[PDB]
Amino acid sequence: EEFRPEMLQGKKVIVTGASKGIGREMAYHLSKMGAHVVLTARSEEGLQKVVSRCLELGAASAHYIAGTMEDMTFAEQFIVKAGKLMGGLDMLILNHITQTSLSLFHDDIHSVRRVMEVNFLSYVVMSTAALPMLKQSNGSIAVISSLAGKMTQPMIAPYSASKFALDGFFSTIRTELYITKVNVSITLCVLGLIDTETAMKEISGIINAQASPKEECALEIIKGTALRKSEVYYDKSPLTPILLGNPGRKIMEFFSLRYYNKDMF
Amino acid sequence: EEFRPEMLQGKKVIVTGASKGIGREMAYHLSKMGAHVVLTARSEEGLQKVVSRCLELGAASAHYIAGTMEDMTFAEQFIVKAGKLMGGLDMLILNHITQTSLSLFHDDIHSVRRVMEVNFLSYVVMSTAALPMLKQSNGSIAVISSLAGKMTQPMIAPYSASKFALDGFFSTIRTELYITKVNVSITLCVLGLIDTETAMKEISGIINAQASPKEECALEIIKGTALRKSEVYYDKSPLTPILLGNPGRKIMEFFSLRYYNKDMF
Ligand SMILES: NC(=O)C1=CN([C@@H]2O[C@H](COP(=O)(O)OP(=O)(O)OC[C@H]3O[C@@H](n4cnc5c(N)ncnc54)[C@H](OP(=O)(O)O)[C@@H]3O)[C@@H](O)[C@H]2O)C=CC1
Ligand SMILES: NC(=O)C1=CN([C@@H]2O[C@H](COP(=O)(O)OP(=O)(O)OC[C@H]3O[C@@H](n4cnc5c(N)ncnc54)[C@H](OP(=O)(O)O)[C@@H]3O)[C@@H](O)[C@H]2O)C=CC1
Ligand SMILES: O=S1(=O)N=C(NC2CCCCC2)O[C@H]2CCCC[C@H]21
Numbered sequence: 430e431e432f433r434p435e436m437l438q439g440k441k442v443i444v445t446g447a448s449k450g451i452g453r454e455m456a457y458h459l460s461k462m463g464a465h466v467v468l469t470a471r472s473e474e475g476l477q478k479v480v481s482r483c484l485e486l487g488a489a490s491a492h493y494i495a496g497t498m499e500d501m502t503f504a505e506q507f508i509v510k511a512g513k514l515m516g517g518l519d520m521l522i523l524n525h526i527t528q529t530s531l532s533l534f535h536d537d538i539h540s541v542r543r544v545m546e547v548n549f550l551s552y553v554v555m556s557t558a559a560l561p562m563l564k565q566s567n568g569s570i571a572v573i574s575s576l577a578g579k580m581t582q583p584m585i586a587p588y589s590a591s592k593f594a595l596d597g598f599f600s601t602i603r604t605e606l607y608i609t610k611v612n613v614s615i616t617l618c619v620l621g622l623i624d625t626e627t628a629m630k631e632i633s634g635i636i637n638a639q640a641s642p643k644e645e646c647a648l649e650i651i652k653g654t655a656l657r658k659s660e661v662y663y664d665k666s667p668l669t670p671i672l673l674g675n676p677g678r679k680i681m682e683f684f685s686l687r688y689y690n691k692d693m694f
Numbered sequence: 695e696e697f698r699p700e701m702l703q704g705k706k707v708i709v710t711g712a713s714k715g716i717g718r719e720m721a722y723h724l725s726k727m728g729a730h731v732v733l734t735a736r737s738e739e740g741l742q743k744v745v746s747r748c749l750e751l752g753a754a755s756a757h758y759i760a761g762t763m764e765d766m767t768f769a770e771q772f773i774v775k776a777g778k779l780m781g782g783l784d785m786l787i788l789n790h791i792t793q794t795s796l797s798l799f800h801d802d803i804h805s806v807r808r809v810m811e812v813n814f815l816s817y818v819v820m821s822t823a824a825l826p827m828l829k830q831s832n833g834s835i836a837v838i839s840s841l842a843g844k845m846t847q848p849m850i851a852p853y854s855a856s857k858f859a860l861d862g863f864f865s866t867i868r869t870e871l872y873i874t875k876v877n878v879s880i881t882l883c884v885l886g887l888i889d890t891e892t893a894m895k896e897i898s899g900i901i902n903a904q905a906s907p908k909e910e911c912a913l914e915i916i917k918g919t920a921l922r923k924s925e926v927y928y929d930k931s932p933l934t935p936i937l938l939g940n941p942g943r944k945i946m947e948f949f950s951l952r953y954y955n956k957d958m959f
């Protein structure tokens with residue numbers, strides 16, 4: 430019940446949004462653990478540098494495939510190719526997001542649509558394409574989310590919408606896999622403010638809050654996903670998982686199954 | 695304050711998904727109250743029947759515009775036309791959903807995108823198009839959701855993702871409207887199982903649960919929206935709003951505003 434880095438030695442892992450931030454940090458940890466990694470982002474040069482560092486850090490293998498997660502064809506084909514490169518898949522880390530800026534929502538449809546497409550729809554595309562490989566290996570999916578995917582805050586209406594959608598979709602999948610006795614685990618990672626350049630830049634002169642270090646955040650995601658935890662909370666305050674954990678919802682979800690015809694599962 | 699039907703006499707109301715189920719019942723209740731209504735759904739014939747009955751029931755005026763909410767152009771233009779018809783807008787009822795059957799997740803991306811566009815994107819398009827008129831009248835928006843938009847249960851992963859996304863988006867809009875002193879209210883109506891023809895048919899052989907009556911459901915939505923409540927819970931069990939209400943998220947959302955720069959609003 431306690432994490433050991435050997436749990437990832439020789440494992441076949443995908444990390445999306447791996448050129449910088451938490452994604453790049455996750456690729457490094459996995460590499461030090463001796464895992465096989467396939468990395469993605471739009472930046473070829475950014476991916477080349479991470480792959481090269483991963484190989485130095487002890488990765489069993491490291492490859493990159495560049496493209497945009499706004500294209501559902503690329504998202505799906507990326508899974509198929511990553512799977513063929515490693516000869517299977519043990520863990521899928523859905524980490525990427527499209528660019529978001531803090532602003533009161535005002536006449537901004539186009540941004541809600543592109544945000545929903547990248548932040549949510551490509552996550553559905555990739556988890557669907559990856560599932561047969563994860564079923565064979567009794568794999569895991571880490572779904573990266575935020576406090577804004579469990580509560581609301583001003584200035585992030587499109588982003589919050591997409592992260593709430595991930596919770597609604599992925600918690601239904603987790604339960605469906607559990608009740609059908611499919612040994613594939615789903616870890617929703619609820620992250621507080623992290624000290625990546627993107628998050629720090631985006632809140633500059635808008636929000637004044639303490640950030641958590643990106644390195645430790647990355648390790649916690651990997652550990653919680655390896656341990657098959659339903660949810661991982663990572664924030665400075667110890668109150669965050671207590672206040673966002675929603676025990677009422679958990680009680681309702683437990684009793685919910687009693688109403689279904691057992692034959693469906 | 696208590697709701698009095700006299701509050702809605704002469705008011706200008708839009709109802710979507712008004713050809714059947716709770717939408718139809720809401721059109722009837724508003725008609726009885728003496729409101730002006732503009733109804734929409736795909737069925738021209740279905741809407742013609744509801745409109746005639748609305749007129750017989752005492753509506754100040756009753757009109758319909760048929761079309762599909764998969765088309766964002768129709769969603770927006772409908773709001774503009776409805777506005778022209780009544781000479782303004784006081785209340786916007788966002789009630790439509792796509793056809794939803796219960797199955798363990800197995801849809802392709804085209805099917806999930808369609809659910810996200812109809813159940814979610816069209817609500818964002820319409821609430822955005824209606825905002826100048828609602829700002830002029832100090833109007834209201836009712837966003838129809840379900841228990842599956844506050845917790846998860848098997849066999850409705852896309853539907854649940856779409857309803858969670860509505861909580862995420864609209865709760866952010868509500869807080870933004872509040873902090874900028876805009877007197878436009880937003881009511882998220884979290885509904886339990888309702889005895890509609892569609893819901894009863896879809897659960898046949900799958901779920902055995904107590905349904906609540908459609909005409910009381912309809913009235914409860916109207917009452918809570920007119921009263922400008924942030925959320926309305928409508929279900930047989932009194933444990934439902936207690937267990938789904940999430941006091942912890944409310945505590946966090948309250949404390950969250952203190953991190954922000956006042957000058958941004
Ligand atoms: N940082 C924080 O404070 C917090 C972060 N999170 C979550 O952590 C995750 C990662 O966060 P973070 O590291 O800060 O963000 P970063 O901006 O640091 O990195 C995001 C990654 O996504 C990639 N990316 C951007 N646009 C696209 C696109 N269209 N297609 C494909 N890849 C894309 C970027 O690479 P490239 O530009 O080359 O494509 C980059 O590698 C997200 O899911 C976020 O919601 C949650 C809470 C707080
Ligand atoms: N009934 C229940 O148990 C529950 C219902 N709810 C919520 O209540 C609302 C309505 O419920 P209910 O009355 O049972 O459902 P119904 O199927 O009874 O009616 C839904 C309405 O949506 C219309 N519609 C369907 N597809 C489209 C489309 N593509 N574009 C435009 N309109 C469309 C339908 O008419 P047409 O075919 O003519 O277009 C119809 O008028 C939904 O938002 C649902 O989530 C929440 C919890 C439980
Ligand atoms: O911890 S969060 O809920 N998620 C995030 N997510 C970021 C949003 C901007 C781009 C990087 C990710 O940031 C925090 C600060 C802005 C408001 C929400 C909080």
Ligand SMILES: O=S1(=O)N=C(NC2CCCCC2)O[C@H]2CCCC[C@H]21
Nearest residue numbers: 794840841842885886887892893896
């Ligand atoms: O009350 S709900 O959470 N929402 C709904 N929404 C309906 C889903 C089927 C078509 C009409 C709306 O139905 C209930 C029964 C099936 C599972 C979910 C619950």
